[PDB]
Swiss-Prot record, chain A:
Disease: Neurodevelopmental disorder with speech or visual impairment and brain hypomyelination: An autosomal dominant disorder characterized by global developmental delay, impaired intellectual development, poor or absent speech, and brain abnormalities including hypomyelination, cerebellar atrophy, and optic nerve atrophy. Some patients have severe visual impairment, dystonic movements, and seizures.
Keywords tagged on the record: Acetylation, ATP-binding, Chaperone, Cytoplasm, Disease variant, Disulfide bond, Hydrolase, Intellectual disability, Isopeptide bond, Nucleotide-binding, Phosphoprotein, Ubl conjugation
InterPro entries cross-referenced by the UniProt entry: Chap_CCT_gamma, Chaperone_TCP-1, Chaperonin_TCP-1_CS, Cpn60/GroEL/TCP-1, GroEL-like_apical_dom_sf, GROEL-like_equatorial_sf, TCP-1-like_intermed_sf, TCP-1_chaperonin
Protein name in UniProt: T-complex protein 1 subunit gamma
Residue(s) carrying Phosphothreonine: 423, 452
Superkingdom field: Eukaryota
Top EC class, one word: hydrolase
Disulfide feature: 359-365
Region called Disordered, residue ranges: 1-17
Any one cellular-component term (Gene Ontology): microtubule
Gene (UniProt): CCT3
Swiss-Prot record, chain B:
Entries under Pfam families matching the protein: Cpn60_TCP1
Gene Ontology biological process terms from the UniProt entry: binding of sperm to zona pellucida; chaperone mediated protein folding independent of cofactor; chaperone-mediated protein folding; positive regulation of establishment of protein localization to telomere; positive regulation of protein localization to Cajal body; positive regulation of telomerase RNA localization to Cajal body; positive regulation of telomere maintenance via telomerase; protein folding
Protein name: T-complex protein 1 subunit alpha
Sites of Phosphoserine modification: 2, 487
Gene Ontology cellular component annotations, sorted alphabetically: acrosomal vesicle; cell body; centrosome; chaperonin-containing T-complex; cytosol; extracellular exosome; Golgi apparatus; heterochromatin
Lineage: Eukaryota, Metazoa, Chordata, Craniata, Vertebrata
Alphabetical keyword list: Acetylation, ATP-binding, Chaperone, Cytoplasm, Cytoskeleton, Disease variant, Epilepsy, Hydrolase, Intellectual disability, Nucleotide-binding, Phosphoprotein
Chain positions recorded as Mg(2+) binding sites: 84
Organism, as annotated: Homo sapiens
Record-listed ATP binding positions: 33, 85-87
Residues the record lists as N6-acetyllysine modifications: 195, 396, 490
Binding locations of ADP: 33, 85-88, 154-155, 408, 501
Swiss-Prot record, chain C:
Description of how the protein assembles with itself and partners: Component of the chaperonin-containing T-complex (TRiC), a hexadecamer composed of two identical back-to-back stacked rings enclosing a protein folding chamber. Each ring is made up of eight different subunits: TCP1/CCT1, CCT2, CCT3, CCT4, CCT5, CCT6A/CCT6, CCT7, CCT8. Interacts with PACRG. Interacts with DNAAF4. Interacts with DLEC1.
Taxonomy of the source species: Eukaryota, Metazoa, Chordata, Craniata, Vertebrata
Organism in which the protein naturally occurs: Homo sapiens
Location in the cell: Cytoplasm; Melanosome; Cytoplasm, Cytoskeleton, Microtubule organizing center, Centrosome; Cytoplasm, Cytoskeleton, Cilium basal body
Gene for this chain: CCT4
Boundaries of the shown chain within the full protein: 232 to 385 of 539
Implicated disorder: De novo genetic variants in nearly every subunit of the TRiC complex, including CCT4, have been found in individuals with a broad spectrum of brain malformations, and clinical phenotypes ranging from mild to severe epilepsy, developmental delay, intellectual disability, ataxia, and other features of cerebral malfunction.
Protein name per UniProt: T-complex protein 1 subunit delta
Length: 521, 532, 154
């Protein structure tokens, strides 16, 4: 025994071929999932549930692997999804085909590093080219935004609900802008809560100008319907609490016991009139609520809700503009819940809910998803996540790119020109990258079901013409279509991060040349 | 006659040790030089770790044979001292051991070999100090970029080497530090490195300041402050305990309420004393309670909890704030002074990869440098941060010792022939050890070529020929040169090419390799003990 | 290793080795503060602060600048608050001195220890030409005290 006693090793071209095979398989298991013609994939989770979704990221996230490079690709997919939402419908496919053409230069005995340098030059030129072929677009103009969203979503199940989806996403994203950064305000996608409630139909789902609380009134008396409520956020518990410093009491005289019993009652009262001094209407807390304080608030005709999740508290506060408070004696009218157009408690069926709508200028909002069943609802919300993500990306960058593979073909002939002007050994890898790019439109074609070779040739030949870069591939017709009238547009940053992570995947995998197992630590 | 294990002696154990050393060498033989190809480890459970830096590999690789553990520890030490050369030093040690044994494998008495090795190391370091190149005349940023990007190849980032070297040199010059009163020492690891998967390293950004891997404690509390009011506080923020044993006993119930009242009012007044100073930013390794959070929101200040101690110490050094374990004074009363405050132009939490991290820009007291990495996966990001840490290490060496060495193996290129000539001087048997030292040390070009996959013998011969010519016709100002390359598979002048390495790398490398050879070669028997 | 953040090198340092802990006074036999009243809270807090303050103030008044503290695993070691005072007053400080090392140390630097406040006096404070924390091992840091006017035979 020398090295580690049951740690395997493998070396060289075998390792490179194995990793390339793994990457190719990873790409392959998803190649059918892309495109407006896309398939619909469903998963068997380890612990019983059912998950069905087109989105590649979730598909891969429900994959465990043994070969490592596959795990690397998995993480790559999850990163791209996190950053941009979609493109993962394409990113891993592009990376896999990139690698597949890449390996062809290994048996050329072409050492990897020079190919890597070629890839880096390729990425630089691709970024430049895409920036040259963008289109800036207004952000205020609503219907163009809706068109963008429809374009980015007409690949998953929500397509037939495109109008509702686009309106939902636009409404949600537009009204989430924390202007406190001067003119550099940032939107956030953790206040845009998504709630899945079964029953009803997709058409019933709508944007609620407020928050959803899956709780109920603590006592019968509090009114379940209020026009202009005032809201107080009590982060602290509203009841008598442990003396944190392990206090103790040693009474001697009879009255003392009943007196201390009265004292906690009195403290509860103190908190109660401290609250009511501000003339509130609504009491919210993440902690519990004493039934005695509940009594006093009832006597003041004040609605109280108990034990709500902290994130939910934050969202409510952002909804009615008030700020959370943990000290009733330190309560300030500046945190009065002004800005709640209506307080209500309905029944969805066997369960109460809390509606706080019609805020003056709500900055927080949750979306009410009402469909058929929790798994389809989860698919819907994943699609909504992707849509609202790309919408926010647009609100960060007003630059757009013609998708449908059109940009890909533009990049293709651009790199072809650079290559034929760029003599050297690295030339062949460069044009190899160019050719590898061509497969996104290809996959579009097969998922459509048309003559892939002739269609692709017509596309490429069409795109040698300088006068037009907007020629792309229609999802359903399977015919060459200029993208402008078709209107499938995408945010620039999407496709940027797409290629960028792709070539990173390429370099990271191509540098690998050996395997070692069994670390046991 | 020992229970629970046998023993091995002489030739068997010698060959075994060489065998293990060669094994360890071949483990990393493929990860050195501007064409080095990185390693990666399926751990046991999928948490893989791509890396080409040898010391990392050795540490993460379990080892059982003794001599191999010796080599692993040597690699770890080298990393603790240089940062690269774990690319090289392990190979050097193994090759020297191999040839030394090959001498011993015949008969040759080991201690003679050891003495020859000692002489070889001393001669070699002296000749290097006669082979030194000084950067003081050379342009600072120029040679810094050169050394950086030289280290940057054989790594994931060598392609972006130019950009990365620019960033690294900017950071290191921005982390200047006045030492013992006579030294401009530059602290490695002072620059902060944060990994963030997502965009490419193309978009990886240098921070003219310091960066925090923390978040805003209270969502209602603001996000950006254009003012520099930054206070540090080790002292945690809770409604205080009695903190040792102090039981509270009540014989008059009338006061329990007021007791509880101050149980929080103590923290309240502490906070109010802090804020009345006007500090708008507070940091705390200790806990932060919601009681304090709401007060801060009502004040609109900045609060961060559970920050690592090193980070806040760096904050104090940058902003000029004072680390405060508590509030106190030369007099007993707990007060707080604005003089304790540190400054920085603007402090922002920003969302990178849907995770909010806290930035501190342009502390006026002392310029700080932090670097953010952007990449595809966590694997590439953390391996590149290892790379960058090595980069900062080597640049620190360059600045600390105004002295540079031509890279690409010119070192042993010269050393082999120079020691070859010097060998005949001794006249003993030890010149045989000297010659074997030289020939073994000639391994670096061999590995370079094989990893570059061309005729290695021919490149090595051409190198030796050029250097031997550099040892004829002592008018060598037009006959002394230096260089070797791989990308074109033919020699060059690395001095012109910019391929440079810091001197301390090769110096300490050869010294430690010599020590390792001395240790392992003196072995002649292992005795095993099966455990209790 | 050192325990003060900010002091690394001291020149003309006067050394003193102290055994009694620097923390809240905890008696050999079981003791406890009782709280029953109003001013008890702040009187406590203010007064352990005052006690530690008296300790450190006398320590400085002796003129010492380098502190040595032995193990007191049985009970409280040097308190954090006292460390704050000492660092405020710019005193070199070290925790965790092994009991077996104490005889060697006092032989070497020529400084008899002190186990109570009163006995701590400028008479016993040893002096050494230089003392500081070297930095080797990259970050493995070590203590040196070179040069002593009272040359220990060790």
């Amino acid at each position: 025994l020398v090295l580690s006693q049951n740690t395997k090793r493998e070396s060289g071209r075998k390792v490179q071929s194995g990793n390339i095979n793994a990457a190719k398989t990873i790409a392959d298991i998803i190649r059918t999932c892309l495109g407006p013609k896309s398939m619909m994939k469903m998963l068997l989770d380890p612990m019983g549930g059912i998950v069905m979704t087109n989105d590649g990221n979730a598909i891969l996230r429900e994959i465990q692997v043994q070969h490592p490079a596959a795990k690397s690709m998995i993480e790559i997919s999850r990163t791209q999804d996190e950053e941009v939402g979609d493109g993962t419908t394409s990113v891993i496919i592009l990376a896999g085909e990139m690698l597949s053409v890449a390996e062809h230069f290994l048996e050329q005995q072409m050492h990897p590093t020079v190919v890597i340098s070629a890839y880096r030059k390729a990425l630089d030129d691709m970024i430049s080219t895409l920036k040259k072929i963008s289109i800036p677009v207004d952000i205020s103009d609503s219907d163009m935004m809706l068109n963008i969203i429809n374009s980015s979503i007409t690949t998953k199940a929500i397509s037939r609900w495109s109008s509702l989806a686009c309106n939902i996403a636009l409404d949600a994203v537009k009204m989430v802008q924390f202007e406190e950064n001067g003119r550099k305000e940032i939107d956030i996608k953790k206040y845009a809560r998504v709630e899945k409630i079964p029953g009803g139909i997709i058409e019933d789902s709508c944007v609620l100008r407020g928050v959803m609380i899956n709780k109920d009134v603590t006592h019968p008396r509090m009114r379940r319907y209020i026009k202009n409520p005032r809201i107080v956020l009590l982060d602290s518990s509203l009841e008598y609490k442990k003396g944190e410093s392990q206090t103790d009491i040693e009474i001697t005289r009879e009255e003392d016991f009943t007196r201390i019993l009265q004292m906690e009652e009195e403290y509860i009262q103190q908190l109660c009139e401290d609250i009511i001094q501000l003339k509130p209407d609504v009491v919210i807390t993440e902690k519990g609520i004493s039934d005695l304080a509940q009594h006093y608030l009832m006597r003041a005709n004040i609605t109280a809700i108990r034990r709500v999740r902290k994130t939910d508290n934050n969202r409510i506060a952002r909804a009615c503009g008030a700020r959370i408070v943990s000290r009733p004696e330190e309560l300030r009218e500046d945190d009065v819940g002004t800005g709640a157009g209506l307080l209500e408690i309905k029944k969805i069926g066997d369960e109460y809910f809390t509606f706080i709508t019609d805020c003056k200028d709500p900055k927080a909002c949750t979306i009410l998803l009402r469909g058929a069943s929790k798994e389809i609802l989860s698919e819907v919300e994943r699609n909504l996540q992707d849509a609202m993500q790309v919408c926010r990306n647009v609100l960060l960058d007003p630059q757009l790119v013609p998708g449908g593979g059109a940009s890909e073909m533009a990049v293709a002939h651009a790199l072809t020109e650079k290559s034929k002007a760029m003599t050297g050994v690295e030339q062949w890898p460069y044009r190899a990258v160019a050719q590898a790019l061509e497969v996104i439109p290809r996959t579009l074609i097969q998922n459509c079901g048309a003559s892939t070779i002739r269609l692709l040739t017509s596309l490429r030949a069409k795109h040698t013409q300088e006068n037009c870069e907007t020629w792309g591939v229609n999802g359903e017709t399977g015919t060459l279509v200029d993208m402008k009238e078709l209107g499938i547009w995408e945010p620039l940053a999407v496709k940027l991060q797409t290629y960028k992570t792709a070539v990173e995947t390429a370099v990271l995998l191509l540098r690998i040349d050996d395997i070692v197992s069994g670390h046991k630590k | 006659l020992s229970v629970f294990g046998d023993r091995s002696t002489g030739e068997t154990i010698r060959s075994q040790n060489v065998m293990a050393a060669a094994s360890i060498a071949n483990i990393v033989k493929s990860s050195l030089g501007p064409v080095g190809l990185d390693k990666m480890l399926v751990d046991d459970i999928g948490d893989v770790t791509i890396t080409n830096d040898g010391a990392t590999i050795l540490k993460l690789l379990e080892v059982e044979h003794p001599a191999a553990k010796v080599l692993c520890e040597l690699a770890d030490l080298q990393d603790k001292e240089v940062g690269d050369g774990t690319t090289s030093v392990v190979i050097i040690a193994a090759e020297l051991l191999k040839n030394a044994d090959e001498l011993v494998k015949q008969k040759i008495h080991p201690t003679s070999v050891i003495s020859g090795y000692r002489l070889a190391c001393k001669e070699a370091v002296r000749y290097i100090n006669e082979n030194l190149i000084v950067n003081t005349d050379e342009l600072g940023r120029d040679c810094l970029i050169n050394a950086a990007k030289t280290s940057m190849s054989s790594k994931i980032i060598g392609i972006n080497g130019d950009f990365f070297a620019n960033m690294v040199v900017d950071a290191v010059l921005a982390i200047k530090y006045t030492d013992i009163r006579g030294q401009p020492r530059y602290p490695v690891n002072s620059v902060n490195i944060l990994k963030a998967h997502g965009r490419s390293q193309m978009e990886s950004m240098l921070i003219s300041g310091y960066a925090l891997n923390c978040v805003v404690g209270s969502q209602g509390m603001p996000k950006r402050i254009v003012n520099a009011k930054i206070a540090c506080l080790d002292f945690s923020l809770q409604k205080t305990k009695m903190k040792l044993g102090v039981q509270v006993v009540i014989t008059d119930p009338e006061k329990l309420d007021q007791i509880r009242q101050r149980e929080s009012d103590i923290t309240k007044e502490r906070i109010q004393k802090i804020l009345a100073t006007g500090a708008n930013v507070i940091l705390t390794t200790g806990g932060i309670d919601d009681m304090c959070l709401k007060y801060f929101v009502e004040a609109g200040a900045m609060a961060v909890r559970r920050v690592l101690k090193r980070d806040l110490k760096r904050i104090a050094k940058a902003s000029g704030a004072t680390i405060l374990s508590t509030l106190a004074n030369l007099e007993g009363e707990e007060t707080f002074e604005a003089a304790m405050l540190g400054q920085a132009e603007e402090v922002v939490q920003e969302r990178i990869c849907d995770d909010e991290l806290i930035l501190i820009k342009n502390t006026k007291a002392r310029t700080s440098a932090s670097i953010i990495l952007r990449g595809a996966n966590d694997f590439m990001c953390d391996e590149m941060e290892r790379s960058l840490h090595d980069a900062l290490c080597v640049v620190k060496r360059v600045l600390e010792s105004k002295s540079v060495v031509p890279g690409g193996g010119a070192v042993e290129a010269a050393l082999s022939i120079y020691l070859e000539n010097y060998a005949t001087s001794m006249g003993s048997r030890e010149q045989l050890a000297i010659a074997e030292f030289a020939r073994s040390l000639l391994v670096i070009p061999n590995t370079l070529a094989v990893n570059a996959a061309q005729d290695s013998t021919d490149l090595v011969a051409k190198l030796r020929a050029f250097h031997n010519e550099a040892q004829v016709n002592p008018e060598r100002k037009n006959l002394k040169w230096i260089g070797l390359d791989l990308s074109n598979g033919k020699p060059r002048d690395n001095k012109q090419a910019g391929v440079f390495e810091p001197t301390i790398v090769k110096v300490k490398s050869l010294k430690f390799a010599t020590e390792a050879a001395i240790t392992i070669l003196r072995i002649d028997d292992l005795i095993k003990l099966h455990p209790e | 290793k050192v325990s003060n953040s900010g002091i690394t090198r001291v020149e003309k340092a006067k050394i003193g080795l102290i055994q009694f802990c620097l923390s809240a006074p905890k008696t050999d036999m079981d003791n406890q503060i009782v709280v029953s009243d109003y001013a008890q809270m702040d009187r406590v807090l203010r007064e352990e602060r005052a006690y530690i303050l008296n300790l450190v103030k006398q320590i400085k008044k002796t003129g010492c600048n380098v502190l040595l503290i032995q193990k007191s695993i049985l009970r409280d070691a040097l308190s954090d608050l006292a460390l704050h005072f000492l660092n405020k007053m710019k005193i070199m400080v070290i925790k965790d001195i092994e009991r077996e090392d104490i005889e060697f140390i006092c032989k070497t630097i020529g400084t008899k220890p002190v186990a109570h406040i009163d006995q701590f006096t400028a008479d016993m404070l040893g002096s050494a030409e230089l003392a500081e924390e070297v930095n080797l091992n990259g970050s493995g840091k070590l203590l040196k005290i070179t040069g002593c006017a009272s040359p220990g035979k060790t």
